Amino acid sequence: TSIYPPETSWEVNKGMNSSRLHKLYSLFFDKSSAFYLGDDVSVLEDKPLTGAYGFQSKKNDQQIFLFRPDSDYVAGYHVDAKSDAGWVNDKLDRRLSEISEFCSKATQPATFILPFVEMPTDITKGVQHQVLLTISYDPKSKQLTPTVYDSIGRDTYSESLSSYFKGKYRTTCDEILTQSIEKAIKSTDFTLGKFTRAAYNGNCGSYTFRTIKEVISSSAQGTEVKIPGSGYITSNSYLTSQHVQDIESCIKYRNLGVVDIESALTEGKTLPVQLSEFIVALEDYGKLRSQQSGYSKTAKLTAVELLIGILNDIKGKNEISESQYDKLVKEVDCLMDSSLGKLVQFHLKNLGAESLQKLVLPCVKFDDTI
Amino acid sequence: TSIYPPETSWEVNKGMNSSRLHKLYSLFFDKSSAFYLGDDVSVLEDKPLTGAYGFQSKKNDQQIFLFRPDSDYVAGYHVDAKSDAGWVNDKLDRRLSEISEFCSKATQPATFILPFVEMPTDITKGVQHQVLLTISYDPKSKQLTPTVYDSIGRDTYSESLSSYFKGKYRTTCDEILTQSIEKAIKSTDFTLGKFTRAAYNGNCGSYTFRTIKEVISSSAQGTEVKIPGSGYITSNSYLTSQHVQDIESCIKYRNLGVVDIESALTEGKTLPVQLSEFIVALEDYGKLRSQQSGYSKTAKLTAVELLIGILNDIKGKNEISESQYDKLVKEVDCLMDSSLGKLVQFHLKNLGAESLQKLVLPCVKFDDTI
Ligand SMILES: [Ba+2]
Ligand SMILES: [Ba+2]
Ligand SMILES: [Ba+2]
Ligand SMILES: [Ba+2]
C-alpha cells in the first residue's frame, strides 16, 4: 500500500518482499548507515526512466538506474527439463524492452539494476527466491551485458549436480531469462554480451540489498566484489553486523511513506525519524503483544498505553504533568525490557535522548510546589 | 487444482491449507487409519447440501454434513477494538445462509461442520489460523447452536489478557462471526443457542482435522471430548503418533484426485494406493532433491531414475530383465536410506511387498541360462 509500517518481531531470517526492499531503499542517503552512497548524485532530470531511480556517478559520466522493486518482477522456471524453460512476468519483460529502448538512444554508458524473484513452478509448493539482475550497456560497443547475482550457496560436491542430471533438471531461471533478454532486442542493433550468474556461500533478500549497494558503489569503477572466489573473504565481512542492524532497524522500527522514499531518492536526502514513527511503532508492538509471547502481557500493555499517551500529548499544543512523569518513571524498567526495549532504544537514539526520562523531562509543567 | 500431489518434505509443523485438508478427508474410510469413521454411513441421496458431504449415523436419525474445505472460507478480525469487528468472506456467509435455509425445512436433527481460517487484518503481516465452526440444529427446539474449536493455547496467567485490555484488543473473530450467524437467520424462526469457543493446550491444522474426526464420531452421542478441562488428558493422547503418521503419510506420499476423494466420500470407500502414486511420489522426490539437501545428490538421483524406470516398465505389457534387477539390487541401500527410504517404505507397505527385491522379483524374465 502507500505506507510501510514498522514490523516488530521481524528479522532477517523471516524473508523479504518488494515493500520491505523498497523501504530499505531509504538507507542509501542515511549517513548513520553502512549502505550510504556518497559515490553518487541524483540525476539531471534529463532523461528519467519509468519504474527506476536515476543516478549520476560523482566520479563519472556513468549513469545508474535502480528499479523500484515490484511484486510482478518474477520469473517461473520448470525444474523438469523435458518441460518448457518457463516464463517471465510481462512487466519484467516490459522493463527489459524499455531498457533496450532507452539504450537505443543514449550517449552515456549505463547500468540498470532490477531486483526480482525467481521460482520453481514444477514443485508442489515452491520457494520464491530473491535475486538480482543487472544489465550494463555501453554506447561504444553497442553492447548489453546481463549478469545475475544469486545468494543461496555454491556447489558442495555432495549436492553437486551431475552434467548428465543437469540435462534433466534446471535449478535456475537463466534459460528463460536469457531468452527474454535476446527477445527485448531485435533491432538486432545490440550485440549481446555474455550472460553470467554470480553466486555466494530466507536471508537471501538481505544479501540482495547489500549487492544493490555493492553494484552501484562498485561503479566508482571496476572489480565487482561479492563473497566467494572473487572479492570478500566471507559473507560476514560482506553482510556485516552494522549492515544487519541497519536493515532490521529500518524494517522493524520505522514507518515510511512511499512518497517519503521517492522524494528521498529523487533528490539527495536523509529521512530523519519523526516522533510520530515512535508512536506508530509502539502502537504496533501493542497490537501484536496481545496475542503471542517474567513481565506479564498485561504489564507490557499498561506500559505501552501510558508511554503512547505521554508521547502524543507532547505532540500537541500542550506539555505533560508532574504526575504523568511519575507514572512513566515507574514504567521505564518495563519499557526498556527486552524487545520493547530494543524498540524504545532505537527511537531514543534517533530522537537524541539518553533515556525516556531525559526525553520527556523537559515539557513537564511543575507549577505546583511539592 | 484437480490433483493433490505428494508433498515430500512436508510435515505437520509446515502448516495446513484447504487442499491438504481435503486430501486428508480421504482417511475417513481408510481402515488402517486412526481417523476411520465406522460410526457412520453415506447418506440417502435424499437431501444433499451443496459444498458438503452428507452422513447418516449408524446409531441415529442424526444427520452430519461436513463441508469440503474452501480457500474462501475465511474471517478477518480487527485486533484494535476501536475499529469495526471485522469481516466474513461472502462464501462463508453464503454457507451460513444456506444452512439456515436447510434447517428451516428439515425433519431430522443435524450437525454442520465447517473448517475455516481466521486472521488478524490489523497486523502488518498476520497469521492465517486454522479453526473449526460447527452448527447444530434441532427441530424440536427450532434451535441452532454455534460452537467454534480453536487450538493455539489457553490463558497462561502471564500472557493472560486483562478484562480491561479485552476492551482494547480482540484476539478472535468471534464478534463478527456471531454477527454473521444472527444475520443468516431472520425468519426470526430460529431461536439461536449460545455461541461458544473451545480451546486446547502451525500444527493447528492437524488438530482441526482430529477435531473433525472427533466431532463426527462424538455424535454417536454426547460428551464432546477435546484436550483441556474436559475430555482427554493431554494433546498427545488426542492427536497421537498414529494420527500424525497417518496425516503426514497421506500428504507426503500419496497422489489423489479431487474426483477420487469426492467419490470416496459420496459412497463408503477406501482409496487403495495405486502403483502410479509410487511413481509420481518418486518423481516429485527427484525434482525436489536436485535443489536442496554421505549419499550424494547425484547418487540419490541415479537411484530414483532407475527405480522409476523399473516401476513403470512393470506397468506395461512388459516385465523386467535380469540385468535391471541386478542394478536395482545394487541400488536398494541408496533407496532405503533416510527420507527417500520412508517414502519407498510407505509405498511397499501399501503395495504388499517386504522389500523392493520382493516387489520386483516376480515379473523378471530369466530366459537366459546364467
Ligand atoms: Ba512473458
Ligand atoms: Ba548469442
Ligand atoms: Ba460479508
Ligand atoms: Ba441473542
Author numbering:
A (entry chain A), B (entry chain A): 48 to 248, 256 to 347, 356 to 432
Give verbatim excerpts from the published study on this entry.
Crystal structures of the fragments are essentially identical, solved in space group I422. RavZ structures of both fragments are resolved from residues 47 to 433 and 48 to 432, respectively, whereas the missing regions at the N- and C-termini (residues 1–47 and 433–502) might be flexible and disordered. The C-terminal domain has been recently shown to be involved in association with phosphatidylinositol 3-phsphate (PI3P) and be essential for membrane binding. Similarly in RavZ, helices α2 (corresponding to α7 of Sec14) and α4 (corresponding to α8 of Sec14) along β sheets form a large hydrophobic interface. Because the PE moiety involves interaction with residues located deep in the LBS fold, there must be a conformational change to open the lipid-binding site, for example, by outward movement of α4.
L. pneumophila inhibits autophagy by injecting an effector protein called RavZ into the cytoplasm. RavZ functions as a cysteine protease and irreversibly deconjugates mammalian Atg8s from PE to inhibit autophagosome formation. As a consequence, the RavZ-cleaved Atg8 proteins cannot be relipidated, leading to inhibition of autophagy.
